[PDB]
Design a protein around this ligand. Structure first.
Ligand SMILES: [Mg+2]
Ligand SMILES: [Mg+2]
Ligand SMILES: [Mg+2]
Lengths: 177, 149, 202, 132, 113
RNA sequence: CCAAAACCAGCCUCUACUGAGCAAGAACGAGGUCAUGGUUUUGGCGGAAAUGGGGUGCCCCCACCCGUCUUGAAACACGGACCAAG
RNA sequence: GUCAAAACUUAUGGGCUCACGAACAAUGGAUGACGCUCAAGCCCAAUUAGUGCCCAUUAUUCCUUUGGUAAGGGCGAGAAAGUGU
RNA sequence: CGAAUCGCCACUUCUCUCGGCGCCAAGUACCUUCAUAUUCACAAGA
């Protein structure tokens, strides 16, 4: 399916004051289902880092970021996450995908299973595309070879839904349902 | 037959049902980038491998190959024009003609599927002379008992 | 006269998926006739499933086992119990549907040579099991659990097969005729029809 | 005149009878009656044995196939008309016109045979997946 | 077209021969019926009131009006399409002969003529 | 009286921006429907028919014996065989 | 998945898992039962797919009732100055 | 005794990993019966 997580870049600042007349603007890449969550995660880091809070700031740009292309490539996602079982595991897993958004959402499902880690426990720390060689991880390294061929072994080929059937004659594909 | 870049998968169950398209580049083990200049709707996209059925055809090609390179190379083989030639392809366009068909074409078929099923018997009845059939073979031997009486 | 029965061939189907799909069709009024219930598979090693069954067999009324749960050991009786557990077995709607199912070990001579045998693709073993995971063929576990006819059925299954195969080449001259007769039917007077047959793939 | 009779049902179109005495009979739609009234399909009875008679548009399946029967004069089909000589005479005058209108068409030999056809929902058959 | 055609019977009238079928509102905390559990009998309420312009109207379409003697028939002379005289049960077959051949002459309806 | 179709109304369903995307707007067309309103039409039925009620059975489904004191009753808590009169 | 309405076992989604697994020591027996194991389990995400569905005494809407010490209008058979029929 | 049911077959009706036909002329030639059974209504027919 298309990626779970859209790629937002939320930009914002603490709102101007005589206390801080010309406040720093903050860019912040997020991978969120939708902007309202990206805007939220953005204000999470604003208070967890800048001590500025949602009441006192103002997002200047919620906009989603355009995909680099569509060619299959290779992503080093850097993903801190939390648990009672582990309170802050920095962890640069690599994923092979067509987009930063896809590598990242792929990193959430991966991270949610190997670690019972919800979206809001996780925080992406960056998602570089990587060249073939830099990927130390051995799993996706199997897919680098320009000459890689593999079988689609032991397929379950379900019929197109329009054609699916409950009962069929045994060495035939006459329907009987 | 192995899936690799240049393999000519047949999309199965998606919005682009019957359509084929070359495997431009593997992503990981459960996805690929399908492509095919010959159809309008086979612009490069991420098919899942569950969704594709590899075909016996496969142009030689290099991963992440550009599309204009492909509208080239497959043209120099006509892997597509060659593919439609196969009964495996015709069967797909055949069912895709019956489903696409109007009611009078289905008359116009039944008249043939009887015109032929009728001559299947006419050929057979003529050939009924040569055994076997329950009606003729059973009877020729069946008389064997009658001649003995 | 025969009713609109459909004789599901249960070989290499998952027990509980086939039992679930069949149990539904019986409610929708289908009069199914399961066969080769000996050949139903179950996930896991036979030891996993013998122990599951022997924990079943372990359950009886102390007061009077005679009226207790009954532990049928026929793969077919096991499939009927599996399929009655999946339908309203106390309302008459379901007590009825359960009697519309006829399980058999093997495929009995009344049910053979009666018509084509259906299959349940959603309950196929290859469709369900991960292929390299171990699986329990049902009549095989239940041989170890008390079914006494596991070899009676195999002797029967051997006979219908050797018999069905003898009839498959008793008729090879016949099927070969219609293949030849039908191919030369295209060459016959069906001219414009030959183009309406080319379209549509005939 | 007024007519909401749908675009799929037009005069001279072939049309399956879904209900009534003549189920499954392909039948040319000769005309719609003067008000948004029931169609007057006709067999022709020369083929499938369907008399000139009325049918509601809801009870036929207007096939895409038709015949350019603008040439035929179905004017004698009027509501006031609705076996006596005056009527037996009417269809004879019409079916012969309607039947030749079928002849003029290329592929007019099938449509004669196509109207001898009888529709039937055979088992495994899926009209909803059908187009017509 | 009535809301409810069934009687609202007393709870458990069916078990106790003495109990009349006639409704009594259930009481007792634990009454299944007043606690209005779904499988139980219903209780009457304002919501079962019949539609108010079809109310009191007998299937004949007339509202019944009691009648006792021939003079009552003229109480229905001018509204004979609205009211239908139902002669009282205890008027004699004697007098009913008189009410009836007069309820005929006047075009007034009678439920039991 | 039972039906069916139609009509009208109602009702419902089914560009813009951005860098291919949206946080984005309608249109055309068509469908559904009277347990919506008004307009009949057309057929079917007509000693019986028809709608309604009543009775008995079944089917599917729902459904813990009531009164009681009690925080809590289906309670392994009390009172409760039947009916009549009181 | 069946029981059970709904994924006629949907996904053209990701991982994980072989033995169990699915909010608040003794009558035989309980993920509710069956059964499930490329799950019918778990984490995650989804909704026809890189181009959803089912079930409320709930909501909305319609009809009816009742109440309002609610708001108005009015005064072929009816038109009563009226709390209440 | 009026019924509900509505594809058949020795081309499926073996095994182990597009079955044939039928659908209105016994055939692709429309010869040719069908009405008033009067526009749905259990197919009034198997
Ligand atoms: Mg106490
Ligand atoms: Mg269900
Ligand atoms: Mg009948």
């Amino acid at each position: 399916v298309k990626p779970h997580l859209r790629h937002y870049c939320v930009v914002g600042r603490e709102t101007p004051s005589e206390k801080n007349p010309a406040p720093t603007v903050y860019k912040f890449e997020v991978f969120a289902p939708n902007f309202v969550v990206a805007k939220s995660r953005f204000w999470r880091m604003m208070r967890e880092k800048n001590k500025v809070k949602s009441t006192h700031g103002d997002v200047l740009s919620c906009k989603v970021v355009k995909d680099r292309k569509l060619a299959a490539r290779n992503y080093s996602v850097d993903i801190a996450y939390y648990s009672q079982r582990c309170g802050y595991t920095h962890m640069v897993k690599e994923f092979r995908d067509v987009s930063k958004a896809g590598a990242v959402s792929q990193a959430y499902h991966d991270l949610a299973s190997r670690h019972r880690a919800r979206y809001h426990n996780i925080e992406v720390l960056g998602v570089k595309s990587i060249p073939n060689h830099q990927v130390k991880r051995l799993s996706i390294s199997e897919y680098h070879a320009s000459n890689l061929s593999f079988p689609l072994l032991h397929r379950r080929v379900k019929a197109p839904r329009k054609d699916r059937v409950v009962f069929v004659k045994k060495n035939t594909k006459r329907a009987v349902v | 037959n192995y899936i690799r870049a240049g393999r000519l998968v047949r999309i199965i169950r998606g919005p682009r049902q019957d359509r084929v398209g070359v495997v431009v580049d593997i992503i990981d083990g459960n996805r690929v980038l399908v492509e095919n200049p010959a159809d309008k709707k086979m612009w490069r996209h991420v098919q899942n491998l569950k969704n594709v059925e590899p075909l016996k055809f496969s142009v030689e090609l290099s991963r992440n190959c550009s599309t204009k390179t492909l509208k080239n190379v497959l043209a120099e083989k006509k892997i597509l024009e060659k593919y439609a030639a196969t009964k495996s392809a015709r069967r797909i366009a055949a069912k895709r003609a019956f489903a696409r068909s109007t009611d009078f074409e289905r008359y116009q078929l039944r008249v043939a599927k009887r015109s032929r099923a009728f001559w299947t018997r006419k050929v057979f009845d003529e050939n009924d002379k040569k055994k076997p059939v329950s009606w003729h073979k059973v009877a020729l031997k069946k008389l064997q008992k009658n001649a003995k009486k | 006269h025969r009713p609109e029965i459909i004789v599901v061939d249960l070989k290499d189907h998952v027990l509980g998926r086939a039992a679930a799909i069949v149990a539904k069709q019986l409610l929708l009024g289908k009069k199914i006739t399961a066969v080769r219930c000996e050949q139903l598979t179950i996930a896991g090693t036979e030891i996993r499933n013998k122990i599951k069954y022997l924990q079943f067999l372990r359950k009886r009324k102390l007061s009077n086992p005679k009226l207790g749960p009954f532990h049928h050991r026929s793969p077919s009786d096991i499939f009927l119990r599996t399929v009655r557990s999946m339908l309203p077995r106390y309302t008459k709607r379901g007590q009825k549907a359960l009697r519309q199912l006829v399980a058999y070990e093997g495929i009995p001579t009344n049910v053979v040579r009666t018509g084509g045998r259906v299959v349940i693709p959603k309950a196929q073993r290859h469709y369900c099991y991960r292929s390299e995971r171990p699986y329990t063929v049902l009549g095989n576990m239940c041989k170890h659990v008390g079914w006494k006819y596991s070899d009676v059925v195999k002797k029967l299954e051997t006979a219908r097969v050797e018999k069905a195969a003898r009839h498959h080449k008793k008729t090879e001259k016949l099927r070969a005729a219609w293949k030849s007769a039908r191919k030369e039917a295209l060459s016959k007077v069906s001219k414009n029809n030959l183009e309406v047959l080319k379209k549509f793939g005939y | 005149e007024y007519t909401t009779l749908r675009k799929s049902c037009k005069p001279g179109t072939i049309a399956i009878i879904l209900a009534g005495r003549f189920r499954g009979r392909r039948v040319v739609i000769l005309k719609q009656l003067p008000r948004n009234g029931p169609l007057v399909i006709s067999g022709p009875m020369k083929y499938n044995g369907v008399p000139i008679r009325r049918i509601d548009s809801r009870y036929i399946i207007a096939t895409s196939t038709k015949v350019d029967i603008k040439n035929v004069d179905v004017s004698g089909i009027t509501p006031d008309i609705f076996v006596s000589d005056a009527r037996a005479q009417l269809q004879k005058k019409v079916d012969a016109a309607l039947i030749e209108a079928i002849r003029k068409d290329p592929l007019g030999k099938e449509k004669a045979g196509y109207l001898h056809s009888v529709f039937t929902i055979k088992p495994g058959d899926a009209p909803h997946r059908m187009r017509w | 077209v009535k809301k409810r055609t069934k009687r609202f019977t007393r709870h458990k009238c069916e078990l106790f021969p003495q109990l009349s079928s006639s409704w009594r509102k259930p009481r007792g905390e634990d009454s299944p019926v007043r606690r209005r559990y779904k499988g139980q009998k219903a209780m009457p309420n304002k919501g079962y009131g019949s539609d108010r312009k079809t109310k009191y109207i007998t299937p004949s379409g007339f509202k019944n009006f009691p009648i006792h003697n021939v003079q009552d028939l003229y109480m229905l002379l001018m509204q004979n399409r609205k009211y239908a005289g139902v002669i009282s049960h205890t008027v004699g077959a004697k007098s009913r002969k008189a009410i009836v051949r007069k309820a005929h002459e006047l075009d007034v309806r009678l439920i039991n003529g």
